[PDB]
Amino acid sequence: ERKEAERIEQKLERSEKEALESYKKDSVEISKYSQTRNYFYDYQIEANSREKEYKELRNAISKNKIDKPMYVYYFESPEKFAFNKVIRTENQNEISLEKFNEFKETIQNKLFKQDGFKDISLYEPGKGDEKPTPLLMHLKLPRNTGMLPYTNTNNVSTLIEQGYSIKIDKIVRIVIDGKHYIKAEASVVSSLDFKDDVSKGDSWGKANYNDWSNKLTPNELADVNDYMRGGYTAINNYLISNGPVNNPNPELDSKITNIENALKREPIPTNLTVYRRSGPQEFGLTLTSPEYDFNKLENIDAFKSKWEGQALSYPNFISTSIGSVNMSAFAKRKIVLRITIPKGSPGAYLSAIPGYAGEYEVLLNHGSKFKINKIDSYKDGTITKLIVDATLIP
C-alpha cells in the first residue's frame, strides 16, 4: 500500500519528516527510550535530548487514525507476558507439550500493558519476514488508534504507540515453514491514563469530583477532612496492627466504617491507572536487606521469581498518586505500584476539593486485594528502580 503511504506522507511537514527519518535508522534505541520515560522527575522529562523526538513522534502517530477496528500482527517476546523462560530456542524446531502447558497457565487471567512505540503489520507473517521469537500474537486494535505507515527502501511497515492493556483468550500451536510457533489472540482494553498530562489529569479530576461533596452532609465532610489532615499516621497504623482481632474498639471502628462508606459511595465511570510509590517496609523488607538492593541483577530476578504472579493486599487505607512523575516527598522509594482500576471499582479523587489535600491523593477501601502481573525495572541514574503492574480485584 505504498500509494496510501505517499498520499499520507506529503501532509507531514518537515518536523515529522525528520522525526521519521531519525526513527528509521534508530528504531531500537528510540523505542527503548519510549518505554521508560515518565517515571523520572519533573525536570529530567524536559531536559533530555530526545523528549522532543518522543513528543513529535506521538503527534505524528496520532495525526492519522483508523475508523474501524482492524487486526494487526507482530512478534512479541514471551518476556513481556510474565514468562521468564524460553519456550523454544532459535535453532530448534518443535515446542514441548509441557512448555505449552505452563505458558497457557501463566496467562490465564492477567492483563499486560505496553507503553512504547512498536512496529506492527496488517498481514500474517509469510515469506520474506524475520521472526524474532517463537511467540506470535494476533492483535485487535480498536477504533480511532494511531496509524502512520512508513516505507523502507523496498517494503512498508507500520508504527503505533500503545497506551492500553491487552488480554489473550486462547493460544494454539501452528507450523510456519517447518517450525512450531504459538499463536495468541488478544484484544485491546480501553481506559484513561495521564503519563505527563498534569493539566489534563487535573482537569479530569476537577470535572468529575467537583460535585462529589454536594451529596454529603457537612459533618461527614468535616470528619473526612479532619481525619486526612490530622490522623493519617494513626488509623493506618491501627489497621496494620490488626486492631479488630487484638484490641476491638468502636471509637475507631466507627471511623473505619464511615471512611469505607464514603469511599465506596462513588465508583469511577472509566478505567484509570494510579501510581503508588510503595515503601520497602510494605513488602516486609528493610534497607539493610541484601534482597532489597536492586542495583544487582540477581535481586531483581529473585524478586520477580517470588513476587510476579503472586497476590498482594493492603490492610491499611490505600493512598495513590495519579501522577507518574517522581515526587520530592517520595523520592527515595524504589518501588512504584502501577495499579489498574477498572470501571465500577472504589476510589475517590481528593484533589478536587480545595486546599492542599496531598499529592493527588486518592483513598480506597482498606484490606483491598491486589494482583501482580509483571515486575520490570529501569535505569534510574546509577540505581535501578522497580515497577509492579498491580491489578484491583473485587
Binding site: 506529503q10 501532509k11 507531514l12 511537514e13
Partner: protein, 48 residues
C-alpha cells in the same frame, strides 16, 4: 494573446477532424458550427 487551435481528435494529436460532403455543403450554405462544452477535468492543490 491569440486563441488556441483545436484541430486533432485522436489521443496523440495525429489525426485531424474530418467532415462529410453534405456537411461541407451545409457549411458552404452559410450555416455555423456551435461549440458546447460538456465537462472539464482539472486538479486542485493541497498545501503542506
Amino acid at each position: 494573446l491569440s486563441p488556441l487551435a483545436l484541430n486533432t481528435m485522436d489521443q496523440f494529436s495525429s489525426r485531424l477532424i474530418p467532415i462529410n460532403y453534405d456537411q461541407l455543403k451545409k457549411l458552404d450554405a452559410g450555416k455555423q458550427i456551435k461549440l458546447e462544452t460538456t465537462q472539464v477535468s482539472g486538479n486542485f492543490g493541497t498545501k503542506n
